[PDB]
Symmetry: C4
Subunit: 473 residues, 4 copies
C-alpha cells in the first residue's frame, strides 16, 4: 500500500540540510518489516553527501531491506559521486538518457601560507610532537612534507579503493570497470561519441536510461497509482512516522561527540568539552543506563576539553558501567584521546582515526607592526606577562611551551599504552601524529574491531546483559 521514497535533502550527520544517520537507518529497518511499504525509491537530487562510513551504514540497512525481498530503486537525471555511492545499493538504477555518472576520485587539498606570513613579517611559533602531525604545515611551509604526503596518500588511496570495491560488489562488476582512470574513462567515452549515459549503461554502472515521466511509468507499474496524489503510491522519508521504541526500563546511553572539541558549553556544530562530560556523567549516575556508547565523529581539537571528556568516561567505566566507542567517519587526535578509556573500540574501515600527536601555534606581529611604524611598550614584573600578539614571544615562554608540548605527547602515548595493553615505545611507532584508516588502526592495535554502530551497541549489551533500549543524548 506504498513505497518509501528516500528523497533525502541535504547531508547525513551524526546529530542535527542536516539528516540523522540513525533515523534513516532506523526508518529503513522499520519499513522492511512494514506491510504498508512495498519497496524503496531513492531520489538523490538534493542529497549533498555524507561520510563514507555513514553512507556504508545506510548501505547496510538498504541491503537488509533488499534481502527481505522488497525491491530498491535508484532514480535521477544525473549522479554525483557521493550520490552514486548511496545509489549503488539499489536493485535497479535508472539514469536519464542524456544524464551522467560523475565519478572522479578523491582529492585532499589544503592552503599553505609560510610565504604570506614572512611577507607580512609575522612571527610564527610552532610547538609540536609528531612527524606526521601536518595540520601545522600551513604555518611553516609552502607545500606538504614528504612525510605528510606518505600519510595522506595512504589513507586517500585506501578510502578510494574502498569506494570502488563497495561499488564494484554492489554492481557485480570489477572495480576498474566502475572507474578505469582518466585515460580509460576518456577512451571509453570516445567509443561512445561522448555519450555519458551510453558509457554508463554499456559498462554496467547503470540499469536503464529513461525520461523522468517514462520512469514515472515503470514506477506506477510496480507500486500502483494514487489518485489522491496523482502519482505512484508512495510516502517520503520526511513524512513516514518512525515509531517510538518501547521503554524496557534498562538501557544503553548514547553520547555524541560530533565535530570539533572546544572548551566551553557546546556551541555551533562542535563538541563542548563541558556539555559532553555532563551527558556522560548523567549516564553514570542514572541507575537505568547500564552501558555507554560514546559515538565519535570528530577531527580532534582542544586537549583539555578532551581530558575533561575522557575523565568522565573513565569514571563511568570505573563505576562498573561498560563504555564502547563507535567511530564513524573520524575519531582522530583528540577524537582518539576521548576514545581511550573504552572497553572496546570499533571503527569503519574508512574511518580516519589515530593522529596521536600534539601541537600549538603562536603568532605575533611585533615586526609587522614595526614596519608600518607601530610599536609597543610597557612595564612588566615578569617576561611571562609580556605574552600578547603585539609583543615578541619571550624565550622563557618559548622554552616552557616546548616542555609543555613534550609533556603532552608523553601523556598521550601513555594513555594509549595503558588503554591498548601496549608499551609507550610501541605506541610511539604508530603515533607521531600519523592518521590511520580504521583498517590500519585495527592492524596496529589502536582499534579492537571493524564494524559499525550495530557492532558497538551489540558489544555494549554483551559487556552487561539482556533486552535493551537506547537513550540518546
Amino acid at each position: 500500500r506504498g513505497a518509501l521514497l528516500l528523497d533525502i535533502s541535504g547531508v547525513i550527520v551524526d546529530k542535527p540540510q542536516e539528516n540523522s544517520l540513525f533515523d534513516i537507518v532506523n526508518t529503513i529497518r522499520q519499513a522492511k518489516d512494514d506491510r504498508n511499504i512495498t519497496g524503496i525509491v531513492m531520489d538523490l537530487k538534493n542529497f549533498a553527501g555524507g561520510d563514507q562510513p555513514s553512507m556504508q551504514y545506510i548501505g547496510k540497512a538498504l541491503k537488509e531491506f533488499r534481502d527481505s525481498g522488497k525491491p530498491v530503486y535508484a532514480v535521477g537525471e544525473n549522479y554525483s559521486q557521493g550520490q552514486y555511492y548511496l545509489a549503488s545499493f539499489a536493485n535497479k538504477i535508472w539514469l536519464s538518457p542524456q544524464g551522467v555518472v560523475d565519478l572522479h576520485g578523491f582529492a585532499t587539498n589544503g592552503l599553505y601560507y609560510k610565504s604570506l606570513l614572512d611577507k607580512l613579517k609575522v612571527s610564527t611559533h610552532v610547538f609540536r610532537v609528531g612527524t606526521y602531525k601536518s595540520a601545522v604545515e600551513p604555518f611553516i611551509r609552502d607545500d606538504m612534507s614528504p612525510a605528510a604526503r606518505e600519510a595522506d596518500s595512504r589513507w586517500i588511496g585506501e578510502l578510494w579503493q574502498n569506494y570502488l570495491n563497495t561499488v564494484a560488489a554492489n554492481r557485480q562488476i570489477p572495480a576498474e570497470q566502475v572507474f578505469p582512470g582518466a585515460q580509460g574513462l576518456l577512451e571509453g567515452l570516445t567509443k561512445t561519441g561522448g555519450d555519458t549515459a551510453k558509457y554508463a549503461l554499456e559498462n554496467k554502472l547503470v540499469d536503464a536510461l529513461a525520461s523522468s515521466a517514462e520512469i514515472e511509468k515503470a514506477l506506477t507499474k510496480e507500486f500502483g497509482w494514487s489518485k489522491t496524489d496523482k502519482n505512484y503510491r508512495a510516502i517520503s522519508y520526511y513524512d513516514y512516522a518512525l515509531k517510538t521504541p518501547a521503554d524496557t526500563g534498562d538501557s544503553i546511553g548514547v553520547v555524541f561527540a560530533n565535530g570539533a572539541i572546544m572548551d566551553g558549553e557546546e556551541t555551533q556544530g562542535n563538541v563542548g568539552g563541558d556539555t559532553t562530560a555532563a551527558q556522560i556523567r548523567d549516564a553514570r549516575l542514572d541507575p537505568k543506563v547500564k552501558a555507554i556508547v560514546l559515538r565519535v565523529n570528530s577531527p580532534g581539537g582542544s586537549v583539555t576539553a578532551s581530558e575533561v571528556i575522557r575523565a568522565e568516561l573513565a569514571a563511568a567505566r570505573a563505576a562498573g558501567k561498560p563504555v564502547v566507542v563507535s567511530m564513524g567517519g573520524m575519531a582522530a587526535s583528540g577524537g582518539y584521546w576521548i576514545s581511550t578509556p573504552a572497553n572496546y573500540i570499533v571503527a569503519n574501515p574508512s574511518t580516519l582515526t589515530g593522529s596521536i600527536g600534539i601541537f600549538g601555534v603562536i603568532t605575533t606581529v611585533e615586526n609587522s607592526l614595526d614596519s608600518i611604524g607601530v610599536h609597543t611598550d610597557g612595564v612588566s614584573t615578569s617576561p611571562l606577562a609580556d605574552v600578547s600578539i603585539t609583543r615578541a614571544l619571550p624565550p622563557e615562554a618559548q622554552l616552557m611551551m616546548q616542555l609543555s608540548i613534550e609533556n603532552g605527547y608523553k601523556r598521550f602515548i601513555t594513555l594509549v599504552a595503558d588503554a591498548r595493553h601496549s608499551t609507550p615505545e610501541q605506541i610511539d611507532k604508530i603515533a607521531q601524529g600519523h592518521v590511520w584508516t580504521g583498517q590500519d588502526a585495527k592492524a596496529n592495535g589502536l582499534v579492537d574491531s571493524l564494524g559499525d554502530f550495530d557492532d558497538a551497541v551489540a558489544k555494549a549489551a554483551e559487556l552487561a546483559k539482556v533486552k535493551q533500549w537506547h537513550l540518546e543524548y
Copy 2:
C-alpha cells in the same frame, strides 16, 4: 460615473512596484465595457517601464478601449522614453510647459575584463559552442567580437525601429519626425532656445502644454468633479474591482516561465525547474485543463533545469494536451529550449529569442594566490578529482568539460531540429549562439507566428475546442 486612472507605479512584469501585465490589459478591457468608466487617464510619473512587447500589448488594449469611442488621455511633467511609448497610445497628450519627452534611442552596455583578470593573474577557461554566444565574452576579450557586434546590432536596430514605427503610427507623424537623430534634435532644439516643451508641441510629440492645475481643470471639465474627492471623477487602477471570470468547466492553463532558469525551486525573481515542472504536471493531469500556454520571459539558465521543464511539457503533449508558447519579452537559450516541445510558438516581433548555444566558465586563482605567497597542496586519486577554485584545472578535467559542452550543443541543435521539422546541419546554420528578434525567428522557422498572448491563447483553444477560461499557475 468616472475615469480609469492608470497611475502605474513600478514595472510591468509577466507575473509578480511590480504590476501584472495581464491584470492591466484585462482591467482596461473590462473598463471598455463598463458604463461607469467614461475614459482612461494615464499618469505615468512613478512608472519605471516594461519591455517593448508587453507595453505594446498594453497599447492594444488602449486602442480597443479607444475604439469604443471612450477617450484616453496621457498627462505628466515629463516623459521618459519608456513612459512616452505607452502614452503615445493616447488620444491626447498633455505636457507641462517646461517638460521634456526624452527620446534618445536604445543601447546595450557591458563591462569587459580580460586585462583585469590578466593583471590579477586569474586563469580563465571558457568552454563553448557558438560564435555568437557573446555573454561569455567579458572573460576573454576587452571589447566585443566582430561576430557579437553583428548579432547585437541586428536585433537592436530592429527593436528601435519597431519603437519608432509604433510611435510614428500612434502620433500620425513620420518616424524621422518622432526622432530625427542626434543631429536633427540639436537643430530643432536650437530653433527653440532649448525649450524642449515647445519642441514637443511643434513636432507633434505632444498635443498641449499646461501645468498640473490647468490639466486638472480640463480633466474635470471632461469627467466632472467629485465634491467628495475634491478632484475630477476617477478611480485608480489599484482600487478598481477587476471581476474574476466565471468558471466554465474547460480550462486553458497558463504557466509562467518568468526569469532566469535555476535548478532549485522558485527563488528570488528566478524560475525554479522543479516548481515549473510541477505546475506543468498539475495542469497535464487535471482533467479540466484542455491545453497549456507556457508564457515565457526568460534569458535562459541551467540546461538541466531546462530539461526538467521540457520533459514535462513534452509529457503533456504526448498525453493529448495542446501546448502553446507565448514569448513575451525574452525567450532565449534555455528560454528557447523549454519552448521546443510546443505545437505552436508565437513571438512579438520585438521578442528576443534564439541564442541556440552553450557555454561554461571556470576560473582558478592559483597564480593569483601564488603572487601573495599563498599556495595549495594535496594528494589526489585522479587528476579528475583535483578541481577547485585555488588549483590549476587539470588537462584531463578540461577535456571532459569540452566534451560535455560539445555535446550539450548536439543535444540542443537536435531538439530544435526535431521540434522545428529540420535537420542538425540546417539548425547549426542559424544557431551557433546568435540571438534573433521574434521576426528573424519567424523568418528562419524557429517561431511559428508573430503575435501576443491573445494569439497564443487563441491557438490553444483552437487546437482543442470551444468555450474557455484561464487557470493560472
Copy 3:
C-alpha cells in the same frame, strides 16, 4: 502652578520635525507671557545644539516680549557654546560657572575640494553651469575656492557675524568689540585673568554673576520659591508645559513648510518632496476655509523640476484668489528662492540666506579609471544619446544637449524672477549669476520685499484679505 517656565531645550531648533519646533517654543513663551501662573523664565541650554540665526532671533523676540511684560528671564549654565549664548544673551540676567567659558570664536565656512584626487583616479568630470558664483560645483573642478566664490562667501559670512555681534551687543548693552575683541584682544584679555575664562566673562560683562549649580539653585528658589514635592525651585519644563489649542474662528491662513533640500518624489528623510508639498499647497487651494497661504521656506534648493512643481501649485492658489506670502527662515536659496517667486510678498530675516539665482549639473565618468585597472565597456546603440553611463565616456552629442538645457534653465529662472519682481531678465542677471545674498542684500536689490520674520508674513497674509484668522499648519 505659580512658578518659572523652564526652557531646558534639548537638541536643535527646526521649522518641522532632539528636534524642536521653532513655532512651538515661541508660542509657548508667548502663552507663558499672559499666563498668571508663570512668573518667570529659566533658560537651561546645556543640551542645546543650535538653530539658524534667524530662528534664534525669532525666539529672542518672544523672550523680549516676555521681559517687557515685567516677568524676569534668567540664563543658567556651566558654560555657553556660541549658539547657546546667543539665546542666553536675551536674558535679564545670565549666571555662569566660576570656572566656565563663554565660547565666542566667530563664524566659518569650510569645504573639501577634490580636483586632484579625481585627476589622480583618472575620473572624467563634467560641469554644466550658468553662474560665476554658483559655487557648489567647485569641489569637482578646483583644489580650492574661486576668487569669486570667496567674495560672495565673505560678504554673507562677514555679515551674519556682524549681526550676531550686534544682536548680542545690544542684548548685553556693551560695544560689539567688547562682546568679541578679535583673537589678539581675546588672548590679551584672557592672559590678564591668568586664563580664567569665567572672570574674563564677568569682568567684560558677557555674564552677570558667577555661581555653582547649587548657589544658582539657591538664587532661583529665593525668586520662584521651593517645591516640597519636586524638591526644586518651582518650575515646569517646556516639554511638560501645556500648549493651549488655538480656537478656530472659521477663516484660516494655511501654513506650508518647504523645509530642507527639494527632491522629486514624496517627502522622505528630512527633505522636501516636490509632490508632497504641492499636494499640500493644492489642498489649501481648495479648502474654502483657508483664505491665504504662508509658505515657510528653509531650503538650499534641490531639483529644478520639483521646484517648478511646487511653484506651479503656488501660482495656481494665487490665480485662485488666495494671496501667497513667503516667509524665509535661515535659507531660501536657489530652488528655494524659485519656489518663492509666485508670492504676492516675500519676507526674509536680515540673516536669511537667499538668492543664489543660478543653475548647474554634474557628470562624472570613469572610463579612464577603469581602463587603467584593465576594465572596459563595449556595446551597440541606435544613437550616441543613448550611451550615457557612469562607466562610459560622455558623448559630444549628450554634452551639447546638456549645455543647452542648463542655459535654457538659467533663462527660465531669471525670467520667472523678472516677472515676479517687476524687473527684466537683464536686470535680474546683474544680481543672479549664482550669487547668494543675505536677507539684507535681497532687500536692497529687490529679490525680497521686506525684512522681518514669521509674524510679519502672517500679518501680511491676513492683510491681503480680512479681520480674524487662526493657523492651519499643514504638518500633514
Copy 4:
C-alpha cells in the same frame, strides 16, 4: 539535610555596579557574610572556571569575606581543572585547593602594554598637537613617542612593581609559603618545570600551590563526603550563589547614601558602562536633600575623564558636605585624575593599598590631517570671521587657537593643584611636587597626603557612620 555548600560558581567579571557578564562586588561580599551566619550553609566551594577577573582591591575585599567565613569554622574549598592568575588569587583564600592531575596554576606577573605610533602618524603625514601639564601624564605619549619616556617608565614601574608584590604577599600569606615560592620568577618556573618534565600539576603540588590533584569525578566524591549527597539534585548538597536568596536588610530611617562613580567620566547623563557628570551629580543631589540620608559615601572606580563633568560632580559633593552631611570616599581599583578630582571634597578618603590614584595632571590632544589629504590631492577651503573659528580635523590648527588651548591647559592645571591643596591642607607649590600627572598606589597616596587611610568599603562605611551617628542602613542609588 537541606543544609549544603554555597557554590561560588561565579561567571564573568567582578564590578562595583552591574550595568544592564557582570557581578556586583557587594552582593558577593554580602552573600558570604549572610552565608557565614546561616545554619543552612555548611561551607563554600569556589568553582571559578568561567570567572574572568576583577581588580585587585575588589578581589581582596571578597577574600576578606571569605576569611571571616573560614574563621567561623566553616570550610572553604576551591576546585578547577585550571587556574588563571586572577582565578588563583581568589582560589588561594580557600582552606583547600584541588587541581586536575595535569592542570596548571598560571602565574606570570603583571604587565602594562600600550601602542605607540608617532612613526605611523609621520608616515601618514598627520599633524599632532599635544597640550599638557604633567611629566608623568603619560597617556599622551602614544601620539608623540614610539615607546615610553623614562619618566613614564619610572612611574609605571613603581606602581606595577608594587601591586604585584601585593599579589604575591597576599597569596603567599594565604598559602603559608614564602613569596618566592609562589612565583620564583621566570627562571624559577623554568627550573621547576624542567625538573618536572613539563608537568604543571606536579610542579604546583610539589611547591604547595595546590593541595590535591583530582579529576572532576574524584573531587565530587570528596565534596559529597563533606556536604552529603542530594538524592534529589543528584550532586553533593549545594546551592549556587545565583540562587541564594540574599536577604535585604531591615530598614531603619537613618541611612548612609551610596553613590557609584564607576567608569570613565563623561559629560552627559549616564551612558554605556560610563559615569555621566549629570547623573552622578543628581544622585549626589537626592542624597543632599533626603532627610533620611545622614551621610554619603562616594564609591569610586575611575581612571578619570571629562574636566567639566568632574567639576559638576565635585561641586554637588561640596554642596552635600556643606549642607551638613559628611562625605566619605571609598576608592576601589582606580580613582585617578578626574577620579581624584571628584574625591577632593570629602571628609575622609579611604583607599586599597593596591588602588591606583593620584595622576593629578591635565591634557588634550588635537590631530589634524591637512597634509594627509594634501597628498592624496584633497584640500579644504572656506572663509572665516576669525582664525578661532577655523578649527576642524581637515584644517591646520591656527596659531591663535593653539595659544588658547595652551592657556586653557595651564589654567585647568592650576585649578587642579589648587583644588587639591585646599582639600588636603597643603599648598599649590607643595602639591606640585607630587602631581605632575604622577599616578600613585593607595599606599603611596597615604604616604603623601592624598589619601587619609588604607582600607576597604567596610572602612568607608564605618567612618561615615562615625561622622554622624547610631545604627544605620544603606541606600544604594542604582538603576
